[PDB]
Design a protein around this nucleic acid. Sequence first.
RNA 1: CAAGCUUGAGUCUCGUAGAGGGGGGUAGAAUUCCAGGUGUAGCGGUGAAAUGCGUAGAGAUCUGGAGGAAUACCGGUGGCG
Length: 117
Amino acid sequence: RKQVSDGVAHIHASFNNTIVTITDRQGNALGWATAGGSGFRGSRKSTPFAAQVAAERCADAVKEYGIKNLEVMVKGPGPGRESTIRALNAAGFRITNITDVTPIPHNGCRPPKKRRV
RNA sequence: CAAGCUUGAGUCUCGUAGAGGGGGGUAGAAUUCCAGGUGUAGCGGUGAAAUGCGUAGAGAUCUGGAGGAAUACCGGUGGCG
């Protein structure tokens, strides 16, 4: 029901999960996939493979809007930075930018206790 | 006890470095919450789970606002006390 042309892949790479979210150039979200959505719990949720499928499962969900190009913003540490920025290429978009937008405090807020494990 | 001396101890002159102390302003990043827009089924968490949050629209994403605390990089068997 629409055109957009130019979008923005926001990949959010926690340790437990990845969320890819494709959005247009001014913030408004079109589609999203998670690792947990793609049939993966627990150990397998995390992995760089189930980051991939996340990408696809999302590049599938924006045939409708008929995107050609996107920028990739990457927010976080985890596995599926490197994998997910490759599975948006090979599922048939052009990649203009790749950004790292990971929050670093300029010493700010006290984190939680060390784990004893 | 008296009289000295200048090397110990001090005073003055001029400079240099410094997270030394006390009071007053101010900057940017981040977390949390609040009010919106886009959006849809999960999120979060773990060794693996559940309790927990979510179709009363969460998480993701963008805009605006509040507030408190701490000051990335510099940063160093560097420095001051």
